[PDB]
Amino acid sequence: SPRYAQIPTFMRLPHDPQPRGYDVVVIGAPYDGGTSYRPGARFGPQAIRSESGLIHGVGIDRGPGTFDLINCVDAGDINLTPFDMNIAIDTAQSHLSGLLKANAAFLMIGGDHSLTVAALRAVAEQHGPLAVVHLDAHSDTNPAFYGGRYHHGTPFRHGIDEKLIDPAAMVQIGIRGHNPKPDSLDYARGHGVRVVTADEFGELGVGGTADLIREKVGQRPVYVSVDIDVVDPAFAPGTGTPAPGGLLSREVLALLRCVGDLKPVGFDVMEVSPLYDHGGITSILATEIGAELLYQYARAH
Amino acid sequence: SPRYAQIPTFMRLPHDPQPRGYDVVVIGAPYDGGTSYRPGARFGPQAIRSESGLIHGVGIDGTFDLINCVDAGDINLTPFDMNIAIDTAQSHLSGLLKANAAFLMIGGDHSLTVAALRAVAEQHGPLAVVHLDAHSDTNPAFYGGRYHHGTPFRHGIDEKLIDPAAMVQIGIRGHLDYARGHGVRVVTADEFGELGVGGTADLIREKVGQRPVYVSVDIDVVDPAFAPGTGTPAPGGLLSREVLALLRCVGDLKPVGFDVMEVSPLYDHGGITSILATEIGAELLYQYARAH
Amino acid sequence: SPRYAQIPTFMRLPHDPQPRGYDVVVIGAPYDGGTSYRPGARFGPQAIRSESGLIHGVGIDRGPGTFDLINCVDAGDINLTPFDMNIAIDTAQSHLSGLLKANAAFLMIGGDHSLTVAALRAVAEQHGPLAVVHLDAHSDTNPAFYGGRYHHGTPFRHGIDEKLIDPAAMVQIGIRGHNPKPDSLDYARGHGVRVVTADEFGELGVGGTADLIREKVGQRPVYVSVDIDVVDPAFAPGTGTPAPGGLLSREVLALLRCVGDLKPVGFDVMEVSPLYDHGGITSILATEIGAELLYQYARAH
Amino acid sequence: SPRYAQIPTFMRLPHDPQPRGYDVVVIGAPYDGGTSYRPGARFGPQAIRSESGLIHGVGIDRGPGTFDLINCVDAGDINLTPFDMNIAIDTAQSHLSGLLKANAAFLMIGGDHSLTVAALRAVAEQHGPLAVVHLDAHSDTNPAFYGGRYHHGTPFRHGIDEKLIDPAAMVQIGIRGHLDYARGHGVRVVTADEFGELGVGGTADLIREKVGQRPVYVSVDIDVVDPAFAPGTGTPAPGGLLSREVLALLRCVGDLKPVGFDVMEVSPLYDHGGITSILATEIGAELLYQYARAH
Amino acid sequence: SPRYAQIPTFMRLPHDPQPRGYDVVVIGAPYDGGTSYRPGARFGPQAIRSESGLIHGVGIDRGPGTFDLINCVDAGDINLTPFDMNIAIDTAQSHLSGLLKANAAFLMIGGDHSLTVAALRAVAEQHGPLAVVHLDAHSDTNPAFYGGRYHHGTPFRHGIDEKLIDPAAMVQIGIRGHLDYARGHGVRVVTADEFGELGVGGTADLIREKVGQRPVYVSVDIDVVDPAFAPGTGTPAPGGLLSREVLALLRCVGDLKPVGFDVMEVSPLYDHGGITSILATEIGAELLYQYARAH
Amino acid sequence: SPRYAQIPTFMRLPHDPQPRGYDVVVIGAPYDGGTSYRPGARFGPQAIRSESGLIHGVGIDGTFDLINCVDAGDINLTPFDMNIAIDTAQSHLSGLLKANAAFLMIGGDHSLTVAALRAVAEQHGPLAVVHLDAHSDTNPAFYGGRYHHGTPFRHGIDEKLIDPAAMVQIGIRGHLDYARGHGVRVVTADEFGELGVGGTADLIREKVGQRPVYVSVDIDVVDPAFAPGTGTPAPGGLLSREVLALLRCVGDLKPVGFDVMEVSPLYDHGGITSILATEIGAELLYQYARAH
Ligand SMILES: [Mn+2]
Ligand SMILES: [Mn+2]
Ligand SMILES: [Mn+2]
Ligand SMILES: [Mn+2]
Ligand SMILES: [Mn+2]
Ligand SMILES: [Mn+2]
Ligand SMILES: [Mn+2]
Ligand SMILES: [Mn+2]
Ligand SMILES: [Mn+2]
Ligand SMILES: [Mn+2]
Ligand SMILES: [Mn+2]
Ligand SMILES: [Mn+2]
């Protein structure tokens, strides 16, 4: 059975739209109603699934494959309307909350970053205020707009504001541009969020940044949220707000190794907009990030 | 001055964001919040402008010598809220009509046409309509999706912006009682083939007569081969030359507004969809001059 | 549930990899081992599924939707090796034969045209020598090659040779170029096949060609095999051997209306190679062709 | 011997950079210095060659193949500078003239349409004032100006002005979009609209009447077909001909006395699926066949 | 007011086709007549403008925005003929000189690199022989020849030869692939290899030492970065710099006395996801910021 | 003569389909019958040739002045039968070596390297190997898939074409006992990062020494950002400059053959994969000159 054969699921996982008893459920969130610039992330889950067949959940020299250590399934997608932002967020919250009643955690494949507010609400409900590892070119702590409460530049502001996040245990890495509009990092920093700009990441290195994550997060339940635009546009052209001067794929993949030293309770990989991609490299990278997160969940638990 | 030089305006027209005294104002509506399938029409005005430099408003055997046109830039449409975006479009388009005769709106998804109909009916009363589309776009609204792109002509008829007895829609195919029951004349792609351009033009003239008419073109009326850059393509469509030839009949009508919607440039190839959209717009501007 | 949401099946049909009791099973054949020029048809089923969500099986003014008249399902794909032509053909034959033990018919989404030999073998086994309506820019009655018994230019030669086809009840429409290599139509014509070149089709028109199909086929069980390259490259750029000067999409779709006047017992839509496509228009057309065939099956039965 | 194997030559013809004694030499002209809008036709020959391996010079029910009737070769390209329009046009004429000293005729693969003036100069030197069949969305009879003598909208104005063309034996077909000079000189202009009325057959009859048996040069701008069929071109014009219409119309060439031809304005950067270059190959293939039929 | 709305200007700056009294005018130069390989840079300004709406002139932790420190405007484009290299270069110089009569400086968005000779001519007229920071995979100090005086490999040879540049204050960085003239004139060449050894910091130190406080022109060929980061360019050269390296290196400009700059060779037809044009915008944005910082 | 002019040969070299007396012959292997995922490498030689005109064999601070090279065209490889295609490649490559010193094979999928190894070992005995790849390609063959693209180095070791104690493979990542058990040195992408270019080059020199060495480059060794046009991309790969810098060490070795495989142009963007492949080939040719 060649890897491109059969209806595409994430990493060729079994499909079950009403999953019960799994460790990690992969759930798509095909929605881009929060996008402020280029849309198209509504196709992110479809494209990521299509390209994911390539990727095995077996590493190099890591012993047993992820899927022999933990039980995972592709639960299909949340039925998110493209016509109403507030309804989509509520729907996502309800669906994600549902998944946690009989499954340990989910990996949400987006979809624009606004959806993370729904995920944080679901996860925080089960675990209390959460530590956060956030990889992004943008802080995403901007204020809501008239008529846009949940644009894709707001999710971590809502997370802090609603106490879904313990900002003293939040680290965001890769920051180098403004999303929707210029807004200082004063809100984040004043709340105690540790911001690691792309510049600082260059100084710290993968190792130093990983140490910083372990120190800030400790063993608190942690949600790891990855905006694909964290990496340079060369590595992830298929995204709605590219920001030149970003991380290399290998830096992001190496950094995520530290997740297995934490207590991850949820994760997401957002903002893949496949129409802007080239050779599917963005969706392939998104898959690999997802795979690494799953493996690290296994290692951690 | 090569045609690609300078900041791109529609057909290299002058730009004036607050125009007054023009015959037709070209106005972009960069918004795709009504799209049900592929988004990207928010970039339609930019792409159309970018490709439009190629196109002269001089045919074979000059528009901008006959009438006064200008590119009024865009309506600032939020991508986050369909209700606010439609209201904003309505306000802006209505404002344009207070000071100028008519507009050509470059979309943007077809939902925006309700705003256009509202503005135009405010000036001319209930309107005749010539609607070119693969889809009827007379589907019901529902709570949470009041202005999806399949509703504009339903809203138009419901709100009495359209006189359905003077509305013809051409090109419908793929995958109608409401429309027909209201008196709308539907010309499927199949029927269009039987009637031909000339028979369809005769039908339009018969149905619309001299009534103030809004001509609304969904780029998806033509086969996906001619317009790949669109959100809901429908195979088995009209040839570009058929649509362009058909639109010559507009000069025999009394056009009071027009639009060219649903160009989604990310799906285009070689810019051909945006070039065709420009040519459609150009034809409409010329026919406005001929009519008036 | 927006049409791009959920794991993609053909026209959003239910999925069942072991279907029993359906009227028409949609089965993918992700294989391009028979391609002589550009490969990539192995991705045809995936791409066709992905773009098919757009298309409803409800026509305009046709009353009840296809799926309210007949029971259809997406059976997933045949696991076709990309490394061995003869094994792939045998595997396809066996799988397709299996489907007919508990289901009335299938719609095979290819995959290169070589696979049709397997389909003809399965269908002929159930119904005896078959009438054939073949839409293609190429006759596909070329001889096998050293090391290539089942290249994509051979299927109708094998069908005639093995008596899977009643050539006196076979019509091929759209012929205008040579595939793999130049070969006269003498073999086909000498066997009594009616060849309607693209030129002749222009003279006959859709209506005249449909009359010709009804006359030649009658009420014999008929297999309808569509090579996407029948239409001009403008309408189907995503294919392995384009041939300029082809039919319009609407001509092909109109012609296929005559299928409901026949006794169809199987069909396929082959040679979509999505890497060469633009805006997905080829896969969208392939979907619509499939939809029309399904509707016509319903009408006929 | 798969069609995509080997270094790409036009229709897998043999290559000879200094051909002598052939019937028709296929010569590339990789230059876009005359382009007024999108450039990229400099890559036309390369892309056409690459996609051409698909296409056999054997038709359906047409008998022996073209290459069994006439001896053809791919002569490579003319070394045309991208930096100087006047030098490129001069170089083109010299090279084309050279080919005609040793071979009966050439099929030039462009490259932008300005190059056709060089071809006309070379061909008229051998045959005298020429009849012309010109397929294009644009008339290409616009005036030259200082600094742009050879923009791509000039070749037929030069041809007429220099008496390389007998305008009373020139027909241009497909004109549309956005003509006194041409008409006043006796050129028959068939707009796309008029072509729709006349049909392929009526237009072919018209061509035969206008050209007669005068030596004729057939020049095809790929932009004559609708952008749907030829997206890869520099100045697309919506509302154009179908591929099948152009190919069928070109059958009339075998009833004429063709002495040269070209296929211009393919700009592969704007193409999709290589369909423009595949069509250009098929047009060239039809022209070669009709050359064999005529002679 | 979404970033993709309105007619596209560079970074959504106001437009004024006859700007007077500004600090820095952004001027497009839509011309690729100097290109030796792939054309298409004529569309550079249009594509850069279209993608630039994304990018704010506000940095991270950098304080007040660029446009709050300096007054900038998009001056539209120079009307450059695609048909004549010499006329285009002359036109460019005239237009750029005009801008300098009424505005402090300009940022030119190309267009192929040959245009830089016109910019250098205009800028040196105001400031005398210039220091130069040149980022490129290629030295662009190749000789001119008759018929191609201004191909895109010549601008810095002209600049040195005409004494528009003080070569003892010129540094070129990124050179690689496939130099006596430049070195013999005192130019400091930093190959991509040497850049790897020196690092961003070492190279910046070198620039500061070489340029000092002499008026300096900063010219960036987008092909300095690896093709992975800038695929949309005419002569890509594998093995190039990372985007982040170029952006970080350009921080040193605020320690200098910049009097002009440009960002050349974007050819959008070869771009993917618009990433080249987005990067070009960010480079321009950094140059404007460093101009404000310097002054 | 502009670099895009003339029929495309590798780096504008002369063409001779039956060469004799050359130092290195460039030979295309247009075949993708071993691909397990995306096909299209059958077009690798054509695309590489098309883009290669850009690249001069003159570095900074001239190859074709040092050694004599030629483009020998392609091997006529059937797309329909893997066993016949491998045998054909072997025969053709062996024929080239009877009359010329070495070849640079431009692929084509990596399965073809078994044929190359067979031909080269016939001239030099069991070979040292430097293999750059995201994948080890030492997977087992099976009936019906004897020469899939994940087998070439397994066949090489099994058939004694390779001395595994003198084989190093660099770049392995993603998703090895056979190889390690045979003495192969595997340098994962992670280890490569620790060692750097210089440490890896030292390791290669130590392992291979002066033994006749075949250098086989899978384009997928570099990150998909640098080489999108390939059949099995693996994120987190090497930068182009790292691969090019590493290959400088070949000039300190005794190279007897090389290849650049798995370019699949349909997935490329801006031709960057084919341009990189050309530069890799160019570097290898220069290092051949330096070594010999
Ligand atoms: Mn972001
Ligand atoms: Mn984000
Ligand atoms: Mn529609
Ligand atoms: Mn519509
Ligand atoms: Mn076919
Ligand atoms: Mn076929
Ligand atoms: Mn033309
Ligand atoms: Mn022309
Ligand atoms: Mn350069
Ligand atoms: Mn340069
Ligand atoms: Mn590999
Ligand atoms: Mn490999």
Curated annotation (Swiss-Prot), chains D, E:
Binding residues for Mn(2+) 2: D136, H138, D221, D223
Q: Which Pfam families match?
A: Arginase (PF00491)
| Cofactor remark from the record | Binds 2 manganese ions per subunit.
* Alphabetical UniProt keywords: Hydrolase, Manganese, Metal-binding
Cofactor requirement: Mn(2+)
What pathway is it annotated to?
Antibiotic biosynthesis; clavulanate biosynthesis; clavulanate from D-glyceraldehyde 3-phosphate and L-arginine: step 4/8
Keyword check for Translocase? no
Can you state which reaction this protein catalyses?
Answer: amidinoproclavaminate + H2O = proclavaminate + urea
Which enzyme class?
hydrolase
Single GO molecular-function term? proclavaminate amidinohydrolase activity
Q: How does it assemble?
A: Homohexamer.
What the entry lists under PANTHER family is as follows: ARGINASE/AGMATINASE, GUANIDINO ACID HYDROLASE, MITOCHONDRIAL
* The name this protein goes by in its record: Proclavaminate amidinohydrolase
Organism source for this protein?
A: Streptomyces clavuligerus
Gene name linked to the record: pah
